[PDB]
Design a protein around this nucleic acid. Structure first.
Ligand SMILES: [Mg+2]
Ligand SMILES: [Zn+2]
Lengths: 73, 1312, 49, 244, 34, 132, 98
RNA sequence: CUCGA
DNA sequence: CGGAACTTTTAGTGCTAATTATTGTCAAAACCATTGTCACGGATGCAG
DNA sequence: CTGCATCCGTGAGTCGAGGGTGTTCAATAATTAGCACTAAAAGTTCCG
C-alpha cells in the first residue's frame, strides 16, 4: 500500500497546476488513487507471482529443472 | 416377511432385546443439508433465498435507483458424472437468477417509473453432488467434512488454577456472535471491572454503558441497592430490614421502640432475624461514624446557594455531614456494600474512569478502536453505532438469540438480530451474581454449547462473502450509471462468485479428498466430526480439556473411534442414531416411558435437555406389556451413574448400538475388548484392501446389511420386477405392471462401472449377482461392488487360525501363512496407477509424439505402434518406454555425458533428446486404457482418431438402445390407443426422432471437439497400468480385534500342523499377546467360527451324499431354532421348496452368524452350538506336527478368524539408492520414493554415533557421501580402482550458511 | 557455534559479533558443523597428534 | 547470490519462487523512489515518509516479526526473512548441517529370522544389488569380463547369473549399519553382517529387538553402508552386536 | 516410560539421635526443644 | 586445513570489496522468455553466465573464447558454479539502522547511547527528534 | 499380574475427568459381558492414557535435545589427577525401610 | 490436511 | 581418400506491429483478520 | 530509590506415503519480438 499511495501523492503534486478548480481536491485525489491502484494491478499482472510455490517444496517434486541436477559420480 | 436378498442366504441372528426403530439412512445428514442449501423456499427460510433477501435490494448514493430480486433457477449439467470424472472439469451447474432494475425520474420524489428492466442474468456456478454426497472438483472426489465449533451466544469461563500467578479464581463473560465483533467482560485479581473488544487494550466496562446514554445516578440505581438515611432531630436514624445484617458484626447497640435488641459486639443469626422481624421494627439508632464510611449514591444540589455539596462516588465526612444537615435535605440515599451480598465493583470502576461525560467517552473509545484520524464529533459516534448496532456488521442469528435467551433464563425464545442496551445490563448483572455466589459456571466441554456446521451452512457463508463483493461492485457501477443505456447484465460479473466458491470447494483445511478403497471408509469419512479448520483450534496447540471425553457424548459422539497420533479426540465420529437439530445441535432418540408402561415411540432429546429428565439402561431386563422385572435399575441423573427405582424413570434407550459409530459396530464381541484394542481395530478396518474373490464373514453383527446398501458402491434396484437381460456390463430390469407409470414407461437400464482408478489406486469393480428369470423386489441389490457379497459388506476372507508358537516365526506379533492361501488365489489385490505424459509448448519448437526416437534400440521400440503409443494389452517391465516424445534440446539440466559432447562439437539444434514417459522400477503392469486429450488447432494421429471412432461407436450403440426402448414404449402406447389422435402420436414420433438426431449431433459435437488444457501445452497422453500384486513375506495383516502383525515366511502345506482328520491349518498366530493386550473376544470369535465351520461341514457332508429335501430341511430347522430366544423365529415350511437348494448351496461354505455389540451371545449358546455338531465341547482339538509328525501335548484351539489385508504392502515402502539426484541450492541428496532419493540421517542419530566413537564413520557419512562436491567423485573413482581411501575436503552447505550470514551485516571469515 | 545451533540464535550472534569472538573449534558439535574429525573417538588421537 | 534464491520456470502456469525476492524488489523500488524524490525538491514530509518506508522495508528484510507488525505478501502468512531462514526447525542449523540426507541407504519392513546368528542379519537381494553397485563395478573391472563401466552397468541392469557370485564375494565380511528412525540411546545403531535372503524385507535376530524397542507390527528401519575401511573396522570393533 | 500429568519401627535395635538438644519431663517421656 | 573462525562486524569498504556489481532495477525476469534482465535482480554481468560455457548474447561459445567478455554485455564466460559465491551491493542513499542491535532485549545501540529503546524507536520512526 | 487380575477378576476403581477416583466401581470382568456405562467409563479412562504418550514424547525429545546440548563439551583426556576430595556414599535409609 | 510408528 | 555440384542453415542487416510504460483524473466518493494453546527470563512503566 | 506487575521475546520430537488456489479505466509514445532477405560458410551425397 504505501508505495502506490506515495506514488499517487507524487503524481498529484507534479500535476497540481492543471487543476482548473471546477471541483474539490478530494475527488481529484480519489480518481488519482484509484487510477494508480489499477495501474499497479496492471503492472503486477505483467510481473510473475511473488509467493506462488515455495522453493523447499520444489526439489521433491515432479519436473524440477534447476532445483535438482542430473549429476552422478 | 423377508425380502429376496435375504432368501438366498439368511443370516442367523442372536440377541434378546427387540428393536423398535429401524436403521436410518446413514448418509442423510449431508444429503439433507445439500437439499436444504438449494431449494425454492418463500418467507425467508434457509438456503440461497436468505442470502438473496439479505443483500438485495441494493440502492445507490441517494440516486433513486434500485435493483430488485424476484427468483432464481438452476440449469442442467452439461456432462455426465463419469465424463466429468474422466475429463477433470468441475461438476457445476449454471445459476440463472432473474433480476429487476427500476430507476426513478429526476427531480421527483414520487416519479412513476416508466422504464422497467427485468432480465435473467448469469452469475457464477455452484458445484453439485452425486447421490452419495461426493463433490467432483478437479477429476477426483472430494467430500466436505463437517466442523464442530462453539455455539453462538454467551459463556462464563472460570479462570482458575495458575491464572496470573495470584492463586485467586476469575470470572469473565464473553459474547460470541455468528458474524461480527466480539465482546468480553473480565475481572482483575483486584476488584476493578474491565472490558475488551477483539483482544485490544484494557479499558473499563462502565464507559461503554455511559456511551449508551446513561448517567451515573442511573448506573448506581441499576446495579446497587438503595439504603435510606433520614434526618431526625438527633443521631441521624436509619431504616432497617433484618435480612441485610447477615454476617456483619454490630459495632453499636441496635435498639428500637425503647428496648435494646443487639449489644455492641454481637453478630446476628437467623433466630435473631426472626426475633427482630416478629417485633416489626424499621427505624433504629445508628451512630455518626457509620454514615462516614459509606458512599453517597446520587448528586445532591443545594437550594440556598445553588451549588453541589457532595459529588457522586465520594465518601462522606463530618463537614459534609454538617453541610447536608444545614442544607435541609432529609432524604439521603447511599449504597449497600457487603462481601457476602454485593461486593464493590461498580464504584471503583466508576472512580477509575477518567471521563465522566459522553463526548470524551466517544473520544476514548475511538482512540482505543482506531489509533489516528482525530475526529470532531463525527467518526466516534458513527463507529460506536456501527460496531455493535448495525445489522450488516452484526449477524446474531436465531440460534444465537436462542442461546442468549436460554443462558439468561428468560421466557421468550425469539427476538431481533441486533443487540440492545438492556441485554448488556442483564449480562453485567449476571456476571455480578455469578461473582457474588449464586448460580454456576458453564464448562466449555459441553455438547449443548457446541454447534456443528454442515456443507450447506459453510457454503452459504462463502456465498454471502462473494455476494457482498458483488454488492460493492454493483454499488460502484450504479454510482455513476445514467438512465436508459443498458440492460442490467453488465452491472454484475461472474467473479468473485465462482472464484470464491472454487477457493472454498477446492482448497481448504476441511475440503479434502476422501480415501476410496473401502465402503466402510466412504461411509465413515462423511460421518466425521472435525474440530479443526477455520473458526476453531489448531491440533498442535490444544490442551488437556478438548481431548478428553465428557459424559454428554452418550449416543451423539463416539468415544472409542478417534485417530491415535497428533490429534486424539479432536477428530470425532458421528454415532448411528445421531441426528442434526434444526438449530444445529445433536439429538438422540429415546423411548417415552409413562408411569406404568414403556410406550414404543421415539423422542429426540438434545444435550441441554439431558439433565432435566432421566434415561434408563439400554440392556435392562424387562417383562412383557412394558414392565421391569426388577425394582432396582441403573440410571443417570445429571451425567453421573446412580441407582434409582422403577417409578422415577421417564425415558428409555431405543437401542444398544447408539453409542458406537458405524465403523466400530461391525467388530463382534466389542464388550469383551479393551478400549485401546477396539480403538486400534476401528482404525485398521478403514484401510482394508479389497481382494480378487470376496468371501462373506462368518461372525457378523447385523450392521453388514446396511453399510453395503446405503453406500454408493452397489446398484440398488429402484423398481422391482423380473430381470430380463443379465450382462457383465449392463443389467436390464423389467418393471412390473402394478408399479408401472401410466404414461411413457418402460424398462430400467443399469450400467455397471468397469475397472477404473480410485483415489487410493484401488481397482473398483462391479459384478452381477442375479441370473436370467430371477425376480427382484424394491430395495434389492443388482450388483456387488468392492468388498461386497450378495448385498453385504465383506472386507476380508476367513481362514483357519491356530494359536501356538511355531519355531519363533510368530515372535512378537508376526503371522505365519501357508502356501494354500497364495495357491488358492485369495489375497491377490489389483492396483491401477496413472502415468501421464504432457507435451508442453517450449522455445525453439514444439514437442512431438513421433515414434522415431533417436539413439534407442530396436528391442525397446517393439512395443510402439506406427503412432508411438503402446498397445492396449501389452505387458511392460520396469524401465521400458510407453509413449515416445522428443525434445528440441532447449532445456537445461543435461547429463554430463551429453554436456561434454555439446562442449566439444554441439549446438546444431537438429538433434532431439530422449525425454519420454517410462515405467518406474519395480512395477510390472498391463496397459488396459489409453486416454488422449488434444487442444483445438493441433493435428491428431491415427490412434487418437481410432479412439474417438471407438467412443463414437459406443455412444451410437447406447443412443440406439435408448431409441429402441423409447420406440418400443411408443409402440406399446400406440397399441394401447386402439383398445385425430394417431396423427398427434405420429407427430410425437417424428419429434422424438428429431430429438434423437439432435442429441446424436450434440454427442458428436461433444466427442469430436477438443477440451481445454493448461496454457501452453499441446496434448496430454494418459496411460493406465494395471499391476497385479500377491502376498509375500513383508506385508501387513490384521484382524478386527486390534491385533496387527507382519507376515514372516511362506510355508508349504506339508510343514503346517494338522489335526487327526488331515486338514492342515493355514494361519499360525501367537497366543502370547492375548493376556497383556486384553482382547479376549478373538477367542470367542474363533470358537464361533469353528462352530459355524462345523455346521457348514455337516451341511456339505449331507449335500455330497445324495439326500432328500426333508432331512436337509429338518437340519436347517434344527440349526435355526436353537433354544436361545433369538429374534429371528423363522420356519422352513413356508418356503417354496425351490430356493431351499439354493440356500443349501449358499450355506455349504459356512454359516453366517450375527452377534450384537452389547447384547452378544453367552458362552452356553456357543457350547450348545458346538454340541450340535461333532466338534468337542471344550473347543480344543489335537493337532500333529508337520515336520516331525509327533503328537502335540496340551491341544491348541483352532477355528476361523476374519482377518483383513492392510494398505501397507512391502512393494510400496522398499527403496534403495546408490547415487541419484542432488539439489542445487544445497549439495545434498533428495528424499522420497517417487524421485530417486535416499533416507535421512536424523539429528538424534548423529548423537547416537557420538555416544560411540566413530569419527571416521561420522565424517564419511556427512562430508564424503553427502556434502562434498569434489570428494564423492574421487571416492567413486577410488572405490572401483581398488582403493578404500577418502578425502575430507569441505562441505558445501556450510558454505551456503557462510554466504547467508555474510549476506547480513555480520562479517565471518576463515583464518590461516 | 554450539549456541547458534541451539535456541536464542540472534542474541548470541549479536553477542559474538560486537565482541570479535574467536572460538578454536574445540568441541563435538562445532566439528560436526564444520565437517571434520571429532576429538572423541578415533579422531581424538588425530587431535592429540 | 541468485543460486541460493532461485526463480525458475515450472511447467504450466505455476512458478517456483523464493520468499526474499519480493522484499528485495520492494527495497530496490523504495531506494529508487527515494533517490528520485530528493532531486525534484520535494517537501520534507514526503521524503520523510519515504525514509520511513525504506526503514520499514530494511528491518522487515533483516528480521521480519520484530517490528510493530509483521508484513505479509500473500496467504495471510509472514514472509521468510534471512533471520527466519536461520532459526526454527527449517533453518540451516537444524535441517541441512546437523542431520542431513545420506547416500547408500535403504528402508524396508522388519521380519523375524530365527535361523540366523547373533552377529548377522538378513538383507534382500535387490537391496544388496542397489547398495553395493561400485564394489560390483570394481570387482567386474578387476576380472576379465567388462572392459568399460558401460558394459558392467548393462550387465548389472540386465540381471544375469554372473553378478550373483560377485555379490556373494563382496558381502563375505562387509558389515552394514542398521538404524531405527526413532533413536533414543546408543543401541539403536548397530552393525550386522548381511546374508542373501529371498524376499523384499530385512530379517533380524529376535534377541537384538529388545535393545531396539521395536515390535513387528509394521515398523520400518533404515540401513547404511560404511563404504570406508576405517568405518568398516570401526563397525567391526565397537558397533558390533556381540560387543554391545 | 514416565508420567506427564510417630510411625512404628519394624526392626529391633538401638535408638540414635543426632544433634541432641533435649530435656526429660516428669512423666518419664523425652521432649525435644530442637 | 584452517584454524579458528573469526566473526566481527562488517565495514562498508569490506562490502564494497565483496561486491561484483550494482543492482539498480527491480525487474527480476521477463515473463515471455526466461532470459534475465540487463541489470535487475537476476543478471549476467553482475553474477555470471546462466549456461555452462555459453554467454548470454550467444556470440562467444567455443573454447577459444573461454575467459573473455563481450562487446556490450561484458560477461566472463565460465561455468554455472560462479553464480553461487559472487554477491552484489545496493548503494542506499539514506542510512538504515540495523534491527538486530536495536531490539535485541537488551539492545546494543541503546546501551551504547545510554538511552532507552523507546526514545530511539521514536527518533528512527520520525515522530521525535534528537539534538547534536 | 494386575492385567490378569483385571482380566479374570473385576477391574476395580476407575478415574473421573476431574482427576480423582469415582466412588462407583466396575463390577465386571473381561470374560463375562460388559455394561454400556462401564465401557463408557473404561474408554474415558483409556483415552487419557492413549493421549498421554502422544503429548509426552514431544517433551521427552525436547528434554533429550536439551540434555545433549548441555553435555558433550567434555572429553576424558587424562588418566589421573591426584586429588583428595570426594563424597561419602550412604544408602537410602530415609523414608521406607530400604 | 491425513495415515503407521 | 581427393574434388565440385547440391543442399541446408546460423549469423548479420532492416522493418513493420504487438508488448512495454506512459498520460489524464476536476458532481461525489462511509474502511482487511484477530478472538478455543502452554510454560520460562527480564527489561521496563507506575507509584509510592 | 526499593521494590511491584506488565508485557515481549524464545521454545513446543522423528521417519516415510498421497495431493496442492489470488480482489482489471481509455488512449497512446516509444520499443522491442518476429520475420523477409542474403550469407556463402558449413554440411551432406557422389564420382574417380
Ligand atoms: Mg511399532
Ligand atoms: Zn555476449
Amino acid at each position: 500500500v504505501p508505495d502506490v499511495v506515495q506514488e499517487a501523492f507524487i503524481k498529484a503534486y507534479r500535476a497540481l497546476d492543471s487543476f482548473r478548480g471546477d471541483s474539490a481536491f478530494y475527488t481529484w485525489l480519489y480518481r488519482i488513487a484509484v487510477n494508480t491502484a489499477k495501474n499497479y494491478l496492471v503492472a503486477q499482472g505483467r510481473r510473475p507471482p511473488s509467493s506462488d510455490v515455495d522453493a523447499i517444496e520444489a526439489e521433491n517434486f515432479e519436473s524440477g529443472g534447476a532445483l535438482k541436477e542430473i549429476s552422478n559420480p | 416377511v423377508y425380502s429376496y436378498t435375504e432368501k438366498k442366504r439368511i443370516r442367523k441372528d442372536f440377541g434378546k432385546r427387540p428393536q423398535v426403530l429401524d436403521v436410518p439412512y446413514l448418509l442423510s445428514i449431508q444429503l439433507d443439508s445439500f437439499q436444504k442449501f438449494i431449494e425454492q423456499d418463500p418467507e425467508g427460510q434457509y438456503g440461497l433465498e436468505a442470502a438473496f433477501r439479505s443483500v438485495f435490494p441494493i440502492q445507490s448514493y441517494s440516486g433513486n435507483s434500485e435493483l430488485q430480486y424476484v427468483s432464481y433457477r438452476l440449469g442442467e449439467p452439461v456432462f455426465d458424472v463419469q465424463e466429468c470424472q474422466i475429463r477433470g472439469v468441475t461438476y457445476s451447474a449454471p445459476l440463472r437468477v432473474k433480476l429487476r432494475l427500476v430507476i426513478y425520474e429526476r427531480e421527483a420524489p414520487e416519479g412513476t417509473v416508466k422504464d422497467i428492466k427485468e432480465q435473467e442474468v448469469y452469475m457464477g456456478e455452484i458445484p453439485l453432488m452425486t447421490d452419495n454426497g461426493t463433490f467432483v472438483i478437479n477429476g477426483t472426489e472430494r467430500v466436505i467434512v463437517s466442523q464442530l465449533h462453539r455455539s453462538p451466544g454467551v459463556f462464563f469461563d472460570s479462570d482458575k488454577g495458575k491464572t496470573h500467578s495470584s492463586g485467586k479464581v476469575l470470572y469473565n463473560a464473553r459474547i460470541i456472535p455468528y458474524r461480527g465483533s466480539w465482546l468480553d467482560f473480565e475481572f482483575d485479581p483486584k476488584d476493578n471491572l474491565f472490558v475488551r473488544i477483539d483482544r485490544r487494550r484494557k479499558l473499563p466496562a462502565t464507559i461503554i454503558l455511559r456511551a449508551l446514554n446513561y448517567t451515573t445516578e442511573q448506573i448506581l440505581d441499576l446495579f446497587f441497592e438503595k439504603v435510606i438515611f433520614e434526618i431526625r432531630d438527633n443521631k441521624l436514624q436509619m431504616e432497617l430490614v433484618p435480612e441485610r445484617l447477615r454476617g456483619e458484626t454490630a459495632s453499636f447497640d441496635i435498639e428500637a421502640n425503647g428496648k435494646v435488641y443487639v449489644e455492641k459486639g454481637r453478630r446476628i443469626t437467623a433466630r435473631h432475624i426472626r426475633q427482630l422481624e416478629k417485633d416489626d421494627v424499621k427505624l433504629i439508632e445508628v451512630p455518626v461514624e457509620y454514615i462516614a464510611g459509606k458512599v453517597v449514591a446520587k448528586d445532591y444540589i443545594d437550594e440556598s446557594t445553588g451549588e453541589l455539596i457532595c459529588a457522586a462516588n465520594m465518601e462522606l465526612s463530618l463537614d459534609l455531614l454538617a453541610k447536608l444537615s444545614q442544607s435541609g435535605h432529609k432524604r439521603i440515599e447511599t449504597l449497600f456494600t457487603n462481601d457476602l451480598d454485593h461486593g464493590p465493583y461498580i464504584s471503583e470502576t466508576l472512580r477509575v474512569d477518567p471521563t465522566n461525560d459522553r463526548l470524551s467517552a466517544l473520544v476514548e473509545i475511538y482512540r482505543m478502536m482506531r489509533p489516528g484520524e482525530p475526529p470532531t464529533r463525527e467518526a466516534a459516534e458513527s463507529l460506536f453505532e456501527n460496531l455493535f448496532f448495525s445489522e450488516d456488521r452484526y449477524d446474531l442469528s436465531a440460534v444465537g438469540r436462542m442461546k442468549f435467551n436460554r443462558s439468561l433464563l428468560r421466557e421468550e425464545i425469539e427476538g431481533s438480530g441486533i443487540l440492545s442496551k438492556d441485554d448488556i445490563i442483564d449480562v453485567m448483572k449476571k456476571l455480578i451474581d455469578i461473582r457474588n455466589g449464586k448460580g454456576e459456571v458453564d464448562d466449555i466441554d459441553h455438547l449443548g454449547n457446541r454447534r456443528i456446521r454442515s456443507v450447506g451452512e459453510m457454503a452459504e457463508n462463502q456465498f454471502r462473502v462473494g455476494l457482498v463483493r458483488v454488492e460493492r461492485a454493483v454499488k460502484e457501477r450504479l454510482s455513476l450509471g445514467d438512465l436508459d443505456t443498458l440492460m442490467p447484465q453488465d452491472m454484475i460479473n461472474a467473479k468473485p462468485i465462482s472464484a470464491a466458491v472454487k477457493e472454498f470447494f477446492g482448497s481448504s483445511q476441511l475440503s479434502q479428498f476422501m480415501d476410496q478403497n473401502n465402503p466402510l471408509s466412504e461411509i465413515t469419512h462423511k460421518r466425521r466430526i472435525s474440530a479443526l479448520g477455520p473458526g476453531g483450534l489448531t491440533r498442535e496447540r490444544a490442551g488437556f480439556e478438548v481431548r478428553d471425553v465428557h459424559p454428554t457424548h452418550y449416543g451423539r459422539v463416539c468415544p472409542i473411534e478417534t485417530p491415535e497420533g497428533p490429534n486424539i479426540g479432536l477428530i470425532n465420529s458421528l454415532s448411528v442414531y445421531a441426528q442434526t437439530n434444526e438449530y444445529g445441535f445433536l439429538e438422540t432418540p429415546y423411548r417415552k416411558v409413562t408411569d406404568g408402561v414403556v410406550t414404543d415411540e421415539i423422542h429426540y432429546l438434545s444435550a441441554i435437555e439431558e439433565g432435566n429428565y432421566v434415561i434408563a439402561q439400554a440392556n435392562s431386563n424387562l417383562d412383557e406389556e412394558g414392565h421391569f422385572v426388577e425394582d432396582l435399575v441403573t440410571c443417570r441423573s445429571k451425567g453421573e451413574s446412580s441407582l434409582f427405582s422403577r417409578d422415577q424413570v421417564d425415558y428409555m434407550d431405543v437401542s444398544t448400538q447408539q453409542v458406537v459409530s458405524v465403523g466400530a459396530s461391525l467388530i463382534p464381541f466389542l464388550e469383551h475388548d479393551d478400549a485401546n484394542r477396539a480403538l486400534m481395530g476401528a482404525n485398521m478396518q478403514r484401510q482394508a484392501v479389497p481382494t480378487l474373490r470376496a468371501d462373506k464373514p462368518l461372525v457378523g453383527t447385523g450392521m453388514e446389511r446396511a453399510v453395503a446398501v446405503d453406500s454408493g458402491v452397489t446398484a440398488v434396484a429402484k423398481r422391482g420386477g423380473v430381470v430380463q437381460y443379465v450382462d457383465a456390463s449392463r443389467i436390464v430390469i423389467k418393471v412390473n405392471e402394478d408399479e408401472m407409470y401410466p404414461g411413457e414407461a418402460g424398462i430400467d437400464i443399469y450400467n455397471l462401472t468397469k475397472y477404473t482408478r480410485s483415489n487410493q489406486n484401488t481397482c473398483i469393480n462391479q459384478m452381477p449377482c442375479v441370473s436370467l428369470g430371477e425376480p427382484v423386489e424394491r430395495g434389492d441389490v443388482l450388483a456387488d461392488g468392492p468388498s461386497t457379497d450378495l448385498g453385504e459388506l465383506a472386507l476380508g476372507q476367513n481362514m483357519r487360525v491356530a494359536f501356538m508358537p511355531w519355531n519363533g516365526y510368530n515372535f512378537e506379533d508376526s503371522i505365519l501363512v501357508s502356501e494354500r492361501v497364495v495357491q488358492e488365489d485369495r489375497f491377490t489385490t489389483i492396483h491401477i496407477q496413472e502415468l501421464a505424459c504432457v507435451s508442453r509448448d517450449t522455445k525453439l519448437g514444439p514437442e512431438e509424439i513421433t515414434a522415431d526416437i533417436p539413439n534407442v534400440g530396436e528391442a525397446a521400440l517393439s512395443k510402439l505402434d506406427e503412432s508411438g503409443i503402446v498397445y492396449i494389452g501389452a505387458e511392460v517391465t520396469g524401465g521400458d518406454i510407453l509413449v515416445g516424445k522428443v525434445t528440441p534440446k532447449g532445456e537445461t539440466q543435461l547429463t554430463p555425458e551429453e554436456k561434454l559432447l555439446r562442449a566439444i562439437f554441439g549446438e546444431k539444434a537438429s538433434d532431439v533428446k530422449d525425454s519420454s514417459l517410462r515405467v518406474p522400477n519395480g512395477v510390472s503392469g498391463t496397459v488396459i486404457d489409453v486416454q488422449v486429450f488434444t487442444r483445438d488447432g493441433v493435428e491428431k494421429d491415427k490412434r487418437a482418431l481410432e479412439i474417438e471412432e471407438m467412443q463414437l461407436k459406443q455412444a451410437k450403440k447406447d443412443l440406439s438402445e435408448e431409441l429402441q426402448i423409447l420406440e418400443a414404449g411408443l409402440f406399446s402406447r400406440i397399441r394401447a390407443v386402439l383398445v385425430n389422435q394417431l396423427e398427434q402420436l405420429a407427430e410425437q414420433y417424428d419429434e422424438l426422432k428429431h430429438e434423437f438426431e439432435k442429441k446424436l449431433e450434440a454427442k458428436r459435437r461433444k466427442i469430436t471437439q477438443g477440451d481445454d488444457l493448461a496454457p501452453g501445452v499441446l496434448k496430454i497422453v494418459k496411460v493406465y497400468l494395471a499391476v497385479k500384486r500377491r502376498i509375500q513375506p513383508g506385508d501387513k495383516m490384521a484382524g478386527r480385534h486390534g491385533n496387527k502383525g507382519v507376515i514372516s515366511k511362506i510355508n508349504p502345506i506339508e510343514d503346517m500342523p494338522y489335526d487327526e482328520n488331515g486338514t492342515p491349518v493355514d494361519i499360525v498366530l501367537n497366543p502370547l499377546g492375548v493376556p497383556s493386550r486384553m482382547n479376549i473376544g478373538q477367542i470367542l470369535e474363533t470358537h464361533l467360527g469353528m462352530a459355524a465351520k462345523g455346521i457348514g461341514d455337516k451341511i456339505n457332508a449331507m449335500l455330497k451324499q445324495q439326500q432328500e429335501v426333508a432331512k436337509l430341511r429338518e437340519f436347517i430347522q434344527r440349526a435355526y431354532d436353537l433354544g436361545a430366544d433369538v429374534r429371528q423365529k423363522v420356519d422352513l415350511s413356508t418356503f417354496s421348496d425351490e430356493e431351499v437348494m439354493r440356500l443349501a448351496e449358499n450355506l455349504r461354505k459356512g454359516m453366517p452368524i450375527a452377534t450384537p455389540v452389547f447384547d452378544g451371545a453367552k458362552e452356553a449358546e456357543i457350547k450348545e452350538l458346538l454340541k450340535l455338531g461333532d466338534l468337542p465341547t471344550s473347543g480344543q482339538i489335537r493337532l500333529y506336527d508337520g515336520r516331525t509328525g509327533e503328537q502335540f501335548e496340551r491341544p491348541v484351539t483352532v477355528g476361523y478368524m476374519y482377518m483383513l489385508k492392510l494398505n501397507h504392502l512391502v512393494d510400496d515402502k522398499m527403496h534403495a539408492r546408490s547415487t541419484g539426484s542432488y539439489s542445487l541450492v544445497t549439495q545434498q541428496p533428495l528424499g522420497g520414493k517417487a524421485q530417486f532419493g535416499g533416507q535421512r540421517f536424523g539429528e538424534m542419530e548423529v548423537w547416537a554415533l557420538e555416544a560411540y566413537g566413530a569419527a571416521y564413520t561420522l565424517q564419511e557419512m556427512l562430508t564424503v557421501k553427502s556434502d562434498d562436491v569434489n570428494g564423492r567423485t574421487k571416492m567413486y573413482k577410488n572405490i572401483v580402482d581398488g582403493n578404500h581411501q577418502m578425502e575430507p575436503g569441505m562441505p558445501e552447505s556450510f558454505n551456503v550458511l557462510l554466504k547467508e550470514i555474510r549476506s547480513l551485516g555480520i562479517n565471518i571469515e576463515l583464518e590461516d | 557455534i554450539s549456541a547458534a545451533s541451539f535456541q536464542e540464535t540472534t542474541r548470541v550472534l549479536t553477542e559474538a559479533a560486537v565482541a570479535g569472538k574467536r572460538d578454536e573449534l574445540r568441541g563435538l558439535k562445532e566439528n560436526v558443523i564444520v565437517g571434520r574429525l571429532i576429538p572423541a573417538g578415533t579422531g581424538y588421537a588425530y587431535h592429540q597428534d | 547470490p541468485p543460486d541460493l534464491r532461485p526463480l525458475v520456470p515450472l511447467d504450466g502456469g505455476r512458478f517456483a519462487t523464493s520468499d526474499l525476492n519480493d522484499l528485495y524488489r520492494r527495497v530496490i523500488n523504495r531506494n529508487n523512489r527515494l533517490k528520485r524524490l530528493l532531486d525534484l525538491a520535494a517537501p520534507d514530509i514526503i521524503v520523510r515518509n519515504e525514509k520511513r518506508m525504506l526503514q520499514e522495508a530494511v528491518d522487515a528484510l533483516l528480521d521480519n516479526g520484530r517490528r510493530g507488525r509483521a508484513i505479509t505478501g500473500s496467504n495471510k502468512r509472514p514472509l521468510k526473512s534471512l533471520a527466519d531462514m536461520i532459526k526454527g526447525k527449517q533453518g540451516r542449523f537444524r535441517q541441512n548441517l546437523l542431520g542431513k540426507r545420506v547416500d547408500y541407504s535403504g528402508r524396508s519392513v522388519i521380519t523375524v529370522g530365527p535361523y540366523l546368528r547373533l552377529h548377522q542379519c538378513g538383507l534382500p537381494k535387490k537391496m544388496a544389488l542397489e547398495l553395493f553397485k561400485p564394489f560390483i563395478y570394481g570387482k567386474l573391472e578387476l576380472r576379465g569380463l567388462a572392459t568399460t563401466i558401460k558394459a558392467a552397468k548393462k550387465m548389472v541392469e540386465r540381471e544375469e547369473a554372473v553378478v550373483w557370485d560377485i555379490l556373494d564375494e563382496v558381502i563375505r565380511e562387509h558389515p552394514v549399519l542398521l538404524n531405527r528412525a526413532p533413536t533414543l540411546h546408543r543401541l539403536g545403531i548397530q552393525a550386522f553382517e548381511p546374508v542373501l535372503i529371498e524376499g523384499k524385507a530385512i530379517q533380524l535376530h529376535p534377541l537384538v529387538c529388545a535393545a531396539y524397542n521395536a515390535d513387528f507390527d509394521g515398523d520400518q528401519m533404515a540401513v547404511h553402508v560404511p563404504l570406508t575401511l576405517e568405518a568398516q573396522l570401526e563397525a567391526r570393533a565397537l558397533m558390533m552386536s556381540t560387543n554391545n | 516410560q514416565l508420567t506427564m500429568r510417630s510411625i512404628q519401627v519394624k526392626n529391633k535395635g538401638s535408638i540414635k539421635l543426632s544433634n541432641v538438644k533435649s530435656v526429660v519431663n516428669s512423666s518419664g517421656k523425652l521432649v525435644i526443644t530442637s | 586445513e584452517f584454524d579458528a573462525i573469526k566473526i566481527a562486524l562488517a565495514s562498508p569498504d569490506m562490502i564494497r570489496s565483496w561486491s561484483f556489481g550494482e543492482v539498480k532495477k527491480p525487474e527480476t525476469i521477463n515473463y515471455r522468455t526466461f532470459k534475465p534482465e540487463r541489470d535487475g535482480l537476476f543478471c549476467a554481468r553482475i553474477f555470471g553466465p546462466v549456461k555452462d560455457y555459453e554467454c548470454l548474447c550467444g556470440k562467444y561459445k567455443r573454447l577459444k573464447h573461454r575467459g573473455v567478455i563481450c562487446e556490450k554485455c561484458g560477461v566472463e564466460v565460465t561455468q554455472t558454479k560462479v553464480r553461487r559465491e559472487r554477491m552484489g551491493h545496493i548503494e542506499l542513499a539514506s542510512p538504515t539502522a540495523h534491527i538486530w542491535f536495536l531490539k535485541s532485549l537488551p539492545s546494543r545501540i541503546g546501551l551504547l547511547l545510554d538511552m532507552p529503546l523507546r526514545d530511539i524507536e521514536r527518533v528512527l520512526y520520525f515522530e521525535s527528534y534528537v539534538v547534536i | 499380574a494386575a492385567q490378569i487380575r483385571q482380566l479374570a477378576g473385576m477391574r476395580g476403581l476407575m478415574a473421573k475427568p476431574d482427576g480423582s477416583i469415582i466412588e462407583t466401581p466396575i463390577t465386571a470382568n473381561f470374560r463375562e459381558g460388559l455394561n454400556v456405562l462401564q465401557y463408557f467409563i473404561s474408554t474415558h479412562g483409556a483415552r487419557k492414557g492413549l493421549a498421554d504418550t502422544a503429548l509426552k514424547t514431544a517433551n521427552s525429545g525436547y528434554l533429550t535435545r536439551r540434555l545433549v546440548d548441555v553435555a558433550q563439551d567434555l572429553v576424558v583426556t587424562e588418566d589421573d589427577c591426584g586429588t583428595h576430595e570426594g563424597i561419602m556414599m550412604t544408602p537410602v535409609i530415609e523414608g521406607g525401610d530400604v
